Amino acid sequence: GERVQLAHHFSEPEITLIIFGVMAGVIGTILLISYGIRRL
Amino acid sequence: GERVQLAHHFSEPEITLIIFGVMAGVIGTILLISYGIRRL
Amino acid sequence: PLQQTGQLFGGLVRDIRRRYPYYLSDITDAFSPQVLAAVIFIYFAALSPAITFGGLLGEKTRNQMGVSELLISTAVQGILFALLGAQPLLVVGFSGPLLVFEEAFFSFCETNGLEYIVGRVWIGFWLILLVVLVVAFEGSFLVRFISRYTQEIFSFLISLIFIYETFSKLIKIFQDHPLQKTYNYNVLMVPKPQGPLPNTALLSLVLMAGTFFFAMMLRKFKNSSYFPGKLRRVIGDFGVPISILIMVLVDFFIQDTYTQKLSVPDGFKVSNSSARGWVIHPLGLRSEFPIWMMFASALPALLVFILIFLESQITTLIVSKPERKMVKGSGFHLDLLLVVGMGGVAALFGMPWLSATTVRSVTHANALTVMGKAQIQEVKEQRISGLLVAVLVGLSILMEPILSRIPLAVLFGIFLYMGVTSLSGIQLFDRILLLFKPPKYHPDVPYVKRVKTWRMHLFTGIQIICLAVLWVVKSTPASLALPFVLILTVPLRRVLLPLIFRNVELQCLDADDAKAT
Amino acid sequence: PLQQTGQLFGGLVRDIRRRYPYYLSDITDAFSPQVLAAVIFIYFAALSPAITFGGLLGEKTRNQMGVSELLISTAVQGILFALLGAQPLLVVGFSGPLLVFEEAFFSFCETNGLEYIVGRVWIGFWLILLVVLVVAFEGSFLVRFISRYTQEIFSFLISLIFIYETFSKLIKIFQDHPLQKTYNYNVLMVPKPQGPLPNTALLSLVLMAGTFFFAMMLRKFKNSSYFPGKLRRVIGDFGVPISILIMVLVDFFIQDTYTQKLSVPDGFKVSNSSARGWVIHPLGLRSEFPIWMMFASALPALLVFILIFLESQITTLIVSKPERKMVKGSGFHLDLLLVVGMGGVAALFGMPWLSATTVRSVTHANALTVMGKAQIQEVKEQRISGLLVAVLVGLSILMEPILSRIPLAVLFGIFLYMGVTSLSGIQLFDRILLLFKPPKYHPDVPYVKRVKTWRMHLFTGIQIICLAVLWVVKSTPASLALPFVLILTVPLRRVLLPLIFRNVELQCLDADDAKAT
Ligand SMILES: *[C@@H]1O[C@H](CO[C@@H]2O[C@@H](C)[C@@H](O)[C@@H](O)[C@@H]2O)[C@@H](O[C@@H]2O[C@H](CO)[C@@H](O[C@@H]3O[C@H](CO)[C@@H](O[C@H]4O[C@H](CO)[C@@H](O)[C@H](O)[C@@H]4O)[C@H](O[C@H]4O[C@H](CO)[C@@H](O)[C@H](O)[C@@H]4O)[C@@H]3O)[C@H](O)[C@H]2NC(C)=O)[C@H](O)[C@H]1NC(C)=O
Ligand SMILES: *[C@@H]1O[C@H](CO[C@@H]2O[C@@H](C)[C@@H](O)[C@@H](O)[C@@H]2O)[C@@H](O[C@@H]2O[C@H](CO)[C@@H](O[C@@H]3O[C@H](CO)[C@@H](O[C@H]4O[C@H](CO)[C@@H](O)[C@H](O)[C@@H]4O)[C@H](O[C@H]4O[C@H](CO)[C@@H](O)[C@H](O)[C@@H]4O)[C@@H]3O)[C@H](O)[C@H]2NC(C)=O)[C@H](O)[C@H]1NC(C)=O
Ligand SMILES: CCCCCCCC(=O)OC[C@H](COP(=O)(O)O[C@@H]1[C@H](O)[C@H](O)[C@@H](OP(=O)(O)O)[C@H](OP(=O)(O)O)[C@H]1O)OC(=O)CCCCCCC
Ligand SMILES: CCCCCCCC(=O)OC[C@H](COP(=O)(O)O[C@@H]1[C@H](O)[C@H](O)[C@@H](OP(=O)(O)O)[C@H](OP(=O)(O)O)[C@H]1O)OC(=O)CCCCCCC
Ligand SMILES: CCCCCCCCCCCC(=O)OC[C@H](COP(=O)(O)OCC[N+](C)(C)C)OC(=O)CCCCCCCCCCC
Ligand SMILES: CCCCCCCCCCCC(=O)OC[C@H](COP(=O)(O)OCC[N+](C)(C)C)OC(=O)CCCCCCCCCCC
Ligand SMILES: CC(C)CCC[C@@H](C)[C@H]1CC[C@H]2[C@@H]3CC=C4C[C@@H](O)CC[C@]4(C)[C@H]3CC[C@]12C
Ligand SMILES: CC(C)CCC[C@@H](C)[C@H]1CC[C@H]2[C@@H]3CC=C4C[C@@H](O)CC[C@]4(C)[C@H]3CC[C@]12C
Ligand SMILES: CC(C)CCC[C@@H](C)[C@H]1CC[C@H]2[C@@H]3CC=C4C[C@@H](O)CC[C@]4(C)[C@H]3CC[C@]12C
Ligand SMILES: CC(C)CCC[C@@H](C)[C@H]1CC[C@H]2[C@@H]3CC=C4C[C@@H](O)CC[C@]4(C)[C@H]3CC[C@]12C
């Protein structure tokens, strides 16, 4: 980073990967819900 | 005129009238000569 | 392209199918002197806003985002968009609305003791989610409801704002260096002139006027019967570069007088090495980032998404008009995905998100327009010019020895040239001119020959009131509401105008392709 | 009018018969706003040369002749010529060749210990004799041998010289007030700035460019489809006055910066009350005037007569061209008699003799030209505009409170406007433009459609060599020989051009009325 940075459990790659995984989960959830709707 | 001017025998009107009279004489001379020429 | 398939990501898939087959021609169509001239012209058109907005951003954010970040973001996003976008003539860069939002968000974060750069990261994360959903459900198809009415109101307003800011910069130069009997001949120069200097304001005015004049004359020459046709067109094609070179040389050979020059950052470094590095931790840099703000970042993300979406998609509509002879197609879904997703990713590196900018993109398209024998004949549609512009913006930090010799006033003349030439194809501007012409002189166009003169003037006047309202909103603290006020013109055209105009009148006055109904 | 009757004073008598019947219309045709605009425009066109040349004359003659004498001579001779002349659109005033002759004669008189003002009196006496004889024998009929070839070479050369001097004055302003880092903020102002001043050169450049730009735009507007037709024409008619007013107000509201202003003499007094009074004694003021110089004054009289005759009669030819739609006729014999005789009389009062000046007269005629719907429709031929201009020049000494607020740079823009607009009807200038055009674009005119392109360009090039030779002669001490070098073009057209051009080619290229042979 720059200067002194507060240390987190998750590093930048780890936390960004987790956020992107949650985002992928939510996107897949909404897409599957859309697939289920419009068919019944 | 202006400042100190040489005194002449003829004043400005007199001298200019004399010059114009001589000019009229010369013009009349050349005109009469032209009238005489082109006819003989 | 604005149709709805009903298939998930269908509009995106269609965009790729439509334009990517032309990929080879998107390279070989660049082999022409007109494309190099366009590169040089749009390079300055893109560099100057980057430098100016980056300076303002650094001033207003304590250098958390500044010139270097904006330069690198512009370069990288432009390269990627040129290589992958469906409309490579769009120019991606920073804009005034984005600067206003950065101001507002920085102020909000200061009030609540938040790290502004981390909040930006979370806005970016929400931006990526929003664009994926919008593109997944083909949300870009709603652009089909933005008719020439709204397109032209937006385009005319942006052009007028561009001209107004260009003139305001010159007025500011006069304010800093007024005309006085006496000056302090010993004035500190670093970092900038600390007091009024002689000849600076007038020389800047002269340089601006001269650049504008030379550009306008060269444009007239390209059209004209002078010189062999091929020479006239190349000289005409390199009109803006030639004008820039002439006025830069004029300023160069005037050693004693000071003129403000372009200034790029020293190197490829963050603007504030004390504040942040290149990568921003989403959980916080100095303080743990609050959890509630991780969710609350969706709303600023919504506003940013709306701003970028409207600017970019209206720009795409304008540059892709049928009358402009674009025969390769554009991708509304793909371009939005690219612009917004790259912006969301850029947030992770403390870099600005961008939008396809109307004046720059229209300037770029016009510089690639080849004119018939009057009538537009074709456009050099290709990816090389935009890619090269982005690369030059990225390399600007290394070419300081060249850029430091270019006065801003020369670029002011070029900006005026862009602003005036951007008004050409706008029917609203054409109709505004008709307000000052007797009817017999109105051209043979359907909205003249099929609409009564006073009805056409009433139609123009209603549009002018919309411009007045929008300009007023721009000049207030609630200027971020501008996209919604602009959206209000779509109901105005579809709900209220038919109450006072007959159908045939509206087909004449608001025509997707300038047709006689 | 150029026919020879064979009767003494016949051409003079015919001139009176031709034009004096229109005397009533020469008054009532002035009742129009175009005529008032022309008055205002030509007032400055005539005043500025009077002031500038009078200043130079005073500097170069020790104020024996200066600004006041030239102003009064211009006013009186203009009034008389307007009331009595056969071509009242000619503007009578001082010119550069006349200034050169005054320089040379003053130098000669200084070398030989002569009173310069008295020698001028005797030159004037000889001038009156010469013109009476020339008019008596219808000598003006020789003007018929000055074809469009010579007319256009002379007109183009005079226009180019006018533009060149206008630009040289601006360059001089920059030389006096260069662009510097530092200035002496305490600089003596009286009589004139004694050192460089800030902002002066650039502000003068801006004022000149702005005046020129506004004049050229207003001229374009008068032609255009904007505004109601009658309003567009009046605004267009008052184009030069409106531009002058705008730029004068701009300079007025800039209090701190210095610009050189028009300066008229304090009152109606001789320039050097110590040197001479109002009436000059032909026999001498301080010393008796030598008799041999009374006869030797004929030769300078011959040279002065040639200068005035050629300038005035070529100007009359140009303004009276058939294509200019002058339907009242001109008097070559009467106008020469008036101009030269009034000059000879003016010498008696220590005042300049004058000539009908080409650029001023063409400007005056063009300001009175009413344009068809492109095609010249008529000319407001009348005596009032010239008479009023002469009266205003005469009254200029009393309107110092107005003239002191007019910067010379504004008039520089107007002079540039005059110089560029004077080139319009010149076929030589039109053909020079064709040298830079591909043949397909050459207009449908007889010298294009009936002459081979390269032959037409050869014809133009020979004319260009004549301009080069004349301009070179102008830039040498033997610049008073210019009328003879110009006369040499008449043998060139009549003796040598037929050796290289066929008859039909010459009828196409040198046409008295632009006819296809
Ligand atoms: C690069 O960034 C430096 C600081 O960056 C810091 O860290 C990054 C990660 C972000 O979180 C930034 O927001 C953060 O500041 C810059 O150094 C800073 O310069 C400015 C200008 O002087 C000052 O910053 C702060 O301004 C606050 C105003 O909103 C001020 O609050 C004070 O304001 C009122 C009146 O306005 C005062 O009456 C109050 O006392 C109130 O405190 C800040 O005050 C205090 O802030 C910290 C809190 O821990 C203290 O430690 C400070 O000593 C200060 O008393 C503060 O002034 C500071 O000078 C400075 N701040 C820090 C933290 O270093 C640097 O200028 C910038 N570089 C460039 C080129 O712009
Ligand atoms: C108004 O006019 C004044 C004089 O006008 C005089 O009378 C009229 C009718 C005309 O005939 C004029 O030609 C005539 O001069 C002006 O006053 C004069 O100013 C100029 C500038 O200083 C000077 O005039 C003369 O300049 C001659 C140069 O050609 C000079 O000759 C001398 O030159 C060489 C070097 O150049 C010297 O080394 C020699 O000594 C040589 O003599 C004149 O010299 C002498 O002339 C007279 C002869 O009688 C003497 O009386 C003088 O004292 C002088 O020594 C002379 O300098 C004079 O200063 C002055 N001359 C006179 C006669 O007053 C006045 O400036 C003008 N006003 C304006 C506003 O321009
Ligand atoms: C800089 C040139 C070097 C000059 C050196 C001197 C030698 C020199 O350069 O001229 C010879 C050559 C003659 O060739 P030519 O007249 O046939 O050339 C035509 C010209 O190029 C036009 O521009 C054309 O139409 P357009 O414009 O494309 O629509 C036309 O094409 P098209 O009808 O078949 O479609 C061309 O044929 O050049 C000129 O064009 C004349 C103008 C020269 C003017 C002089 C230069 C100011
Ligand atoms: C400041 C003026 C006050 C305007 C008051 C605002 C109200 C207002 O003035 O409009 C109505 C009135 C209509 O009058 P109208 O169109 O009939 O007037 C025609 C106009 O003057 C043209 O100029 C004419 O041809 P030209 O030029 O001579 O060749 C034509 O003459 P012609 O065909 O018979 O031969 C004229 O008939 O004005 C206008 O002229 C239209 C343009 C108004 C544009 C207004 C922009 C200022
Ligand atoms: C394509 C070419 C463009 C044409 C448009 C030109 C616009 C130029 C703006 C000038 C006004 C200005 O900038 O005014 C602003 C300044 C200063 O104002 P203040 O009240 O002292 O400011 C108060 C705050 N201080 C104390 C910090 C300064 O005025 C002046 O010092 C007046 C000089 C104006 C010169 C006019 C230039 C020529 C204009 C006409 C050219 C045709
Ligand atoms: C309709 C609009 C007209 C456009 C034409 C403009 C011509 C202006 C003349 C400038 C040159 C000049 O005047 O140069 C002359 C001067 C000084 O020369 P020096 O060597 O110091 O003189 C030596 C003798 N001293 C010591 C007595 C002075 O130069 C300069 O101080 C350089 C500054 C020039 C500014 C350029 C103005 C903008 C030009 C481009 C506008 C499009
Ligand atoms: C649309 C974007 C913002 C993704 C979805 C937002 C929400 C649902 C997700 C994204 C990633 C998540 C965070 C990921 C990591 C952790 C660390 C854990 O010790 C506390 C919760 C916390 C801080 C999560 C809270 C909820 C969170 C912010
Ligand atoms: C063409 C003009 C100059 C007129 C003709 C010039 C000759 C012929 C004439 C005109 C007037 C004449 C002068 C008039 C007055 C006198 C005064 C006298 O005591 C001596 C001769 C003298 C000085 C004359 C000499 C000749 C003269 C100069
Ligand atoms: C408002 C400003 C900017 C422009 C001023 C001029 C406008 C309003 C003028 C110019 C020409 C005018 C028209 C001329 C003639 C007629 C015919 C009449 O039966 C109905 C009105 C109508 C159609 C006029 C309406 C007003 C009009 C359109
Ligand atoms: C000299 C500079 C200023 C102008 C350069 C262009 C001139 C010289 C060019 C332009 C067009 C040219 C002409 C084009 C074609 C031909 C046909 C040929 O069978 C004879 C020569 C002729 C008629 C050329 C002569 C030279 C020409 C007139």
Side-chain angles (χ1 to χ4, degrees), chain A residues 1-2 4-39, chain B residues 1-2 4-39, chain C residues 1-2 4-185 187-372 374-514 516, chain D residues 1-2 4-185 187-372 374-514 516:
Chain A
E2 281 289 358
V4 74
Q5 277 210 8
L6 184 153
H8 309 270
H9 186 301
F10 315 105
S11 60
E12 293 106 353
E14 291 159 5
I15 185 48
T16 189
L17 245 183
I18 278 188
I19 288 146
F20 270 132
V22 174
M23 165 180 345
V26 174
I27 284 161
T29 281
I30 301 193
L31 291 200
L32 298 159
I33 291 157
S34 84
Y35 215 96
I37 310 289
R38 315 185 115 90
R39 155 169 298 164
Chain B
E2 284 289 358
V4 71
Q5 259 184 222
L6 224 39
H8 306 278
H9 186 308
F10 314 105
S11 62
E12 293 106 353
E14 297 159 4
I15 186 47
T16 189
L17 252 177
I18 278 188
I19 288 146
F20 270 132
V22 174
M23 168 181 342
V26 173
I27 284 161
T29 281
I30 301 193
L31 290 200
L32 296 161
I33 291 156
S34 84
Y35 215 96
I37 311 293
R38 315 185 114 89
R39 157 169 297 165
Chain C
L2 291 181
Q4 191 180 353
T5 67
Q7 186 207 138
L8 263 179
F9 290 104
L12 173 60
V13 171
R14 263 97 200 291
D15 287 357
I16 288 153
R17 299 216 137 110
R18 180 184 309 120
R19 182 53 175 268
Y20 274 32
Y22 296 102
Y23 209 99
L24 181 58
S25 61
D26 279 344
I27 299 171
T28 70
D29 282 13
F31 304 156
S32 49
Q34 176 161 1
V35 173
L36 161 61
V39 160
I40 294 166
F41 179 12
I42 306 303
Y43 167 53
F44 290 107
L47 175 59
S48 325
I51 291 163
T52 303
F53 284 129
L56 296 159
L57 210 38
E59 296 163 77
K60 284 144 172 113
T61 62
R62 249 201 308 290
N63 290 266
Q64 267 145 69
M65 288 210 308
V67 178
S68 71
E69 288 90 354
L70 178 47
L71 276 171
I72 293 151
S73 211
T74 298
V76 178
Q77 292 201 49
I79 283 157
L80 285 176
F81 190 85
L83 295 164
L84 309 178
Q87 185 39 270
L89 269 55
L90 298 172
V91 184
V92 177
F94 212 62
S95 64
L98 290 175
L99 179 56
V100 172
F101 168 89
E102 292 305 336
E103 271 248 29
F105 187 59
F106 183 86
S107 278
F108 169 82
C109 276
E110 205 92 314
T111 278
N112 304 265
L114 292 146
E115 304 170 273
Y116 152 84
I117 207 78
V118 191
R120 276 196 87 263
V121 165
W122 284 99
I123 291 163
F125 276 135
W126 279 104
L127 279 169
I128 295 164
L129 178 47
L130 289 170
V131 77
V132 168
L133 294 179
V134 164
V135 171
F137 294 114
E138 308 181 88
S140 275
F141 98 97
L142 295 175
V143 167
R144 74 193 281 81
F145 298 125
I146 299 156
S147 68
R148 171 197 303 283
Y149 196 82
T150 299
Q151 289 169 47
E152 290 196 339
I153 286 158
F154 179 82
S155 198
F156 193 71
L157 183 72
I158 263 61
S159 267
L160 288 179
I161 292 163
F162 192 66
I163 289 158
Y164 185 88
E165 304 307 347
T166 302
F167 270 116
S168 91
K169 290 197 276 262
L170 178 63
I171 299 304
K172 178 81 210 316
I173 292 175
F174 268 83
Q175 271 163 13
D176 288 358
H177 308 269
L179 303 182
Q180 304 177 335
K181 184 182 207 132
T182 177
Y183 298 85
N184 294 325
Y185 62 88
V187 157
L188 281 191
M189 276 338 290
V190 288
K192 70 191 296 301
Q194 302 310 308
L197 300 171
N199 304 303
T200 281
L202 284 169
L203 181 53
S204 303
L205 168 60
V206 162
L207 288 172
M208 183 184 170
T211 322
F212 179 73
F213 164 83
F214 274 108
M216 285 299 229
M217 288 317 97
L218 280 167
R219 194 168 85 104
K220 239 182 59 138
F221 172 74
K222 194 216 270 273
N223 305 319
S224 83
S225 299
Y226 282 102
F227 281 22
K230 291 152 53 55
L231 174 71
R232 173 204 311 136
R233 289 188 243 92
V234 180
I235 299 161
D237 274 314
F238 283 96
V240 166
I242 284 166
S243 331
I244 287 166
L245 183 57
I246 280 157
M247 287 336 270
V248 163
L249 285 169
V250 156
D251 169 84
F252 182 74
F253 287 111
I254 299 161
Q255 195 221 330
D256 293 313
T257 310
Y258 159 86
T259 41
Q260 193 180 148
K261 302 296 203 305
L262 285 169
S263 163
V264 293
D266 253 28
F268 294 92
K269 71 174 127 63
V270 295
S271 286
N272 198 339
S273 66
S274 336
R276 30 75 50 99
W278 281 119
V279 171
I280 289 67
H281 207 131
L283 298 178
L285 308 174
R286 306 306 211 287
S287 173
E288 207 87 22
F289 189 75
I291 294 268
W292 64 269
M293 195 60 219
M294 290 180 189
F295 292 87
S297 289
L299 303 153
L302 290 181
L303 177 63
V304 171
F305 182 87
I306 277 150
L307 296 149
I308 290 147
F309 178 100
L310 261 202
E311 172 101 53
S312 297
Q313 308 270 79
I314 297 188
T315 303
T316 308
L317 279 170
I318 285 158
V319 299
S320 295
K321 286 182 289 127
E323 61 238 56
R324 286 188 83 120
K325 298 313 184 149
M326 303 273 267
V327 305
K328 224 163 272 199
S330 44
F332 287 88
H333 308 258
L334 178 55
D335 285 13
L336 174 84
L337 182 64
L338 283 161
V339 172
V340 179
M342 295 204 285
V345 168
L348 265 152
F349 305 96
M351 314 231 288
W353 42 70
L354 306 173
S355 172
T357 55
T358 295
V359 164
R360 256 157 291 164
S361 296
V362 161
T363 309
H364 184 215
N366 285 346
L368 294 167
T369 312
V370 192
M371 285 301 311
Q375 154 187 353
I376 286 171
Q377 201 252 0
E378 53 161 38
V379 187
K380 304 263 181 35
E381 287 184 277
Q382 34 69 49
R383 294 163 182 285
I384 301 312
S385 73
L387 168 79
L388 288 186
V389 160
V391 164
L392 289 169
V393 177
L395 297 175
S396 285
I397 279 157
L398 292 151
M399 38 202 320
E400 178 269 339
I402 330 168
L403 302 174
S404 53
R405 320 217 73 102
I406 297 156
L408 307 188
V410 179
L411 301 174
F412 293 179
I414 296 314
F415 302 156
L416 189 60
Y417 171 91
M418 293 158 59
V420 298
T421 54
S422 56
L423 304 167
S424 59
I426 313 306
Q427 299 204 357
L428 170 53
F429 173 66
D430 284 326
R431 276 189 278 102
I432 283 152
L433 297 181
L434 289 191
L435 285 153
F436 306 89
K437 267 145 158 276
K440 79 158 127 172
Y441 287 112
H442 295 185
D444 191 70
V445 304
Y447 66 70
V448 164
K449 293 278 123 61
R450 274 157 69 80
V451 183
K452 267 91 173 71
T453 305
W454 80 269
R455 304 275 281 172
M456 180 194 66
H457 286 148
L458 171 61
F459 181 92
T460 306
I462 293 151
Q463 277 195 300
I464 287 154
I465 295 152
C466 288
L467 288 162
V469 167
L470 291 159
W471 181 286
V472 160
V473 167
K474 160 190 104 86
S475 323
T476 62
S479 81
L480 287 188
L482 198 88
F484 305 77
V485 181
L486 183 72
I487 286 327
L488 285 179
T489 60
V490 165
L492 170 59
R493 159 67 183 85
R494 297 185 119 252
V495 183
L496 309 182
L497 287 194
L499 265 53
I500 58 200
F501 291 105
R502 310 310 104 212
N503 277 3
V504 82
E505 290 181 311
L506 291 171
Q507 312 189 285
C508 276
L509 287 156
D510 191 44
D512 39 30
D513 63 29
Chain D
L2 291 181
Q4 191 180 353
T5 67
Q7 186 207 138
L8 263 179
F9 291 104
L12 173 60
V13 171
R14 263 97 200 291
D15 287 357
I16 288 153
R17 299 216 137 110
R18 180 184 309 120
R19 182 53 175 268
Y20 274 32
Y22 296 102
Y23 209 99
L24 181 58
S25 61
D26 279 344
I27 299 171
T28 70
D29 282 13
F31 304 156
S32 49
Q34 176 161 1
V35 173
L36 161 61
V39 160
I40 294 166
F41 179 12
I42 306 303
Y43 167 53
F44 290 107
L47 175 59
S48 325
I51 291 163
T52 303
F53 284 129
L56 296 159
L57 210 38
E59 296 163 77
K60 284 144 172 113
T61 62
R62 249 201 308 290
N63 290 266
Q64 267 145 69
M65 288 210 308
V67 178
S68 71
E69 288 90 354
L70 178 47
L71 276 171
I72 293 151
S73 211
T74 298
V76 178
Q77 292 201 49
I79 283 157
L80 285 176
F81 190 85
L83 295 164
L84 309 178
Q87 185 39 270
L89 269 55
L90 298 172
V91 184
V92 177
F94 212 62
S95 64
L98 290 175
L99 179 56
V100 172
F101 168 89
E102 292 305 336
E103 271 248 29
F105 187 59
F106 183 86
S107 278
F108 169 82
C109 276
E110 205 92 314
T111 278
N112 304 265
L114 292 146
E115 304 170 273
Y116 152 84
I117 207 78
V118 191
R120 276 196 87 263
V121 165
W122 284 99
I123 291 163
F125 276 135
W126 279 104
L127 279 169
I128 295 164
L129 178 47
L130 289 170
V131 77
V132 168
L133 294 179
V134 164
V135 171
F137 294 114
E138 308 181 88
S140 275
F141 98 97
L142 295 175
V143 167
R144 74 193 281 81
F145 298 125
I146 299 156
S147 68
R148 171 197 303 283
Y149 196 82
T150 299
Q151 289 169 47
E152 290 196 339
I153 286 158
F154 179 82
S155 198
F156 193 71
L157 183 72
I158 263 61
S159 267
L160 288 179
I161 292 163
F162 192 66
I163 289 158
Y164 185 88
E165 304 307 347
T166 302
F167 270 116
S168 91
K169 290 197 276 262
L170 178 63
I171 299 304
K172 178 81 210 316
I173 292 175
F174 268 83
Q175 271 163 13
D176 288 358
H177 308 269
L179 303 182
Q180 304 177 335
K181 184 182 207 132
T182 177
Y183 298 85
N184 294 325
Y185 62 88
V187 157
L188 281 191
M189 276 338 290
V190 288
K192 70 191 296 301
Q194 302 310 308
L197 300 171
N199 304 303
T200 281
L202 284 169
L203 181 53
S204 303
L205 168 60
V206 162
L207 288 172
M208 183 184 170
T211 322
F212 179 73
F213 164 83
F214 274 108
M216 285 299 229
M217 288 317 97
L218 280 167
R219 194 168 85 104
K220 239 182 59 138
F221 172 74
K222 194 216 270 273
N223 305 319
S224 83
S225 299
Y226 282 102
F227 281 22
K230 291 152 53 55
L231 174 71
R232 173 204 311 136
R233 289 188 243 92
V234 180
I235 299 161
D237 274 314
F238 283 96
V240 166
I242 284 166
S243 331
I244 287 166
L245 183 57
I246 280 157
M247 287 336 270
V248 163
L249 285 169
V250 156
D251 169 84
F252 182 74
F253 287 111
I254 299 161
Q255 195 221 330
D256 293 313
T257 310
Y258 159 86
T259 41
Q260 193 180 148
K261 302 296 203 305
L262 285 169
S263 163
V264 293
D266 253 28
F268 294 92
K269 71 174 127 63
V270 295
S271 286
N272 198 339
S273 66
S274 336
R276 30 75 50 99
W278 281 119
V279 171
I280 289 67
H281 207 131
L283 298 178
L285 308 174
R286 306 306 211 287
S287 173
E288 207 87 22
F289 189 75
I291 294 268
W292 64 269
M293 195 60 219
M294 290 180 189
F295 292 87
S297 289
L299 303 153
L302 290 181
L303 177 63
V304 171
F305 182 87
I306 277 150
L307 296 149
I308 290 147
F309 178 100
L310 261 202
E311 172 101 53
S312 297
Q313 308 270 79
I314 297 188
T315 303
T316 308
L317 279 170
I318 285 158
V319 299
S320 295
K321 286 182 289 127
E323 61 238 56
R324 286 188 83 120
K325 298 313 184 149
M326 303 273 267
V327 305
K328 224 163 272 199
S330 44
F332 287 88
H333 308 258
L334 178 55
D335 285 13
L336 174 84
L337 182 64
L338 283 161
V339 172
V340 179
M342 295 204 285
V345 168
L348 265 152
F349 305 96
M351 314 231 288
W353 42 70
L354 306 173
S355 172
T357 55
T358 295
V359 164
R360 256 157 291 164
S361 296
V362 161
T363 309
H364 184 215
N366 285 346
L368 294 167
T369 312
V370 192
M371 285 301 311
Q375 154 187 353
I376 286 171
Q377 201 252 0
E378 53 161 38
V379 187
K380 304 263 181 35
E381 287 184 277
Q382 34 69 49
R383 294 163 182 285
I384 301 312
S385 73
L387 168 79
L388 288 186
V389 160
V391 164
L392 289 169
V393 177
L395 297 175
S396 285
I397 279 157
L398 292 151
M399 38 202 320
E400 178 269 339
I402 330 168
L403 302 174
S404 53
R405 320 217 73 102
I406 297 156
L408 307 188
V410 179
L411 301 174
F412 293 179
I414 296 314
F415 302 156
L416 189 60
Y417 171 91
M418 293 158 59
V420 298
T421 54
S422 56
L423 304 167
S424 59
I426 313 306
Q427 299 204 357
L428 170 53
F429 173 66
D430 284 326
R431 276 189 278 102
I432 283 152
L433 297 181
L434 289 191
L435 285 153
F436 306 89
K437 267 145 158 276
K440 79 158 127 172
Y441 287 112
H442 295 185
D444 191 70
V445 304
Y447 66 70
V448 164
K449 293 278 123 61
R450 274 157 69 80
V451 183
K452 267 91 173 71
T453 305
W454 80 269
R455 304 275 281 172
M456 180 194 66
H457 286 148
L458 171 61
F459 181 92
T460 306
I462 293 151
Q463 277 195 300
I464 287 154
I465 295 152
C466 288
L467 288 162
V469 167
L470 291 159
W471 181 286
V472 160
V473 167
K474 160 190 104 86
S475 323
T476 62
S479 81
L480 287 188
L482 198 88
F484 305 77
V485 181
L486 183 72
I487 286 327
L488 285 179
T489 60
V490 165
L492 170 59
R493 159 67 183 85
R494 297 185 119 252
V495 183
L496 309 182
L497 287 194
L499 265 53
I500 58 200
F501 291 105
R502 310 310 104 212
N503 277 3
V504 82
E505 290 181 311
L506 291 171
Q507 312 189 285
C508 276
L509 287 156
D510 191 44
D512 39 30
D513 63 29

